[PDB]
Amino acid sequence: MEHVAFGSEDIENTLAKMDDGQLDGLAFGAIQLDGDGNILQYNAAEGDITGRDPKQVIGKNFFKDVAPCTDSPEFYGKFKEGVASGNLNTMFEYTFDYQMTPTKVKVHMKKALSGDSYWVFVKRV
Ligand SMILES: *C(=O)/C=C/c1cc(Cl)c(O)c(Cl)c1
Numbered sequence: 001m002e003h004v005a006f007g008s009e010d011i012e013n014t015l016a017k018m019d020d021g022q023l024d025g026l027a028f029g030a031i032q033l034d035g036d037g038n039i040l041q042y043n044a045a046e047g048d049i050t051g052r053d054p055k056q057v058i059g060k061n062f063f064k065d066v067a068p069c070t071d072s073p074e075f076y077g078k079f080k081e082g083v084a085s086g087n088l089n090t091m092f093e094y095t096f097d098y099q100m101t102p103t104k105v106k107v108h109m110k111k112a113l114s115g116d117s118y119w120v121f122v123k124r125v
Pocket residue numbers: 031046050052057066067068069070095096097098120122
């Protein structure tokens with residue numbers, strides 16, 4: 001296991017060193033999105049939460065195709081406001097229910113250190 005806690009204040013610094021393999025060592029789901037919501041990285045813990053195969057979702061549009069239940073002001077709206085502003089750091093609970101048993105999670109979105117990239121972190125609640 002990579003020893004990083006969900007919600008850590010410096011999480012973007014810690015995850016900046018991680019290739020796809022290190023990311024798979026986290027205790028929580030981690031997705032990296034570009035500013036348009038395309039999936040750049042998607043770790044094993046996230047796949048365990050959602051059932052999706054991490055390798056297959058990379059390159060897909062998160063808000064349009066993968067996760068339409070997040071296409072709402074409560075999730076996508078927060079993301080895009082952060083992308084527009086350049087300073088995203090928001091945490092909230094949410095239910096994932098698209099083609100899956102509804103699953104309640106805690107979501108933390110945070111701007112990455114790599115230029116136009118944004119993390120979505122997820123854990124069960
Ligand atoms: C609602 O449609 C959510 C779906 C969903 C959310 C996340 Cl974070 C995720 O990783 C997947 Cl594959 C689907």
